[PDB]
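Q: Joint fold for the lines below.
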Amino acid sequence: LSASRSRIKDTDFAKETAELTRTQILQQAGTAMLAQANQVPQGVLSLL
Amino acid sequence: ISERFGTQIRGTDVAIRNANDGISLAQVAEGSLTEIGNNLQRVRELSVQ
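A: Joint structure:
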């Protein structure tokens, strides 16, 4: 019974680490693109 | 096609889980039958005398 219970409640350490790494990279990509998008509209001032 | 592939993968995961549960059920049944057999063996040995 103890063997049966563990199949549906325990963590698989081999798979979770990859998801952690992927999410960490995506966060940095998003932050950089956000800074770029914020900086974009500055070019209108030269027309004045 | 991407949505269909998503359906396929998400079904596959819970399919894996169901197969594991079937394995567990079979194991438990075999575990009980072993002890039944041992008791029968003992009774036969006692009855030979």
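Q: Anything notable?
A: Chain B has one helix and no strands. The two ends of chain B are 74 Å apart (CA to CA).
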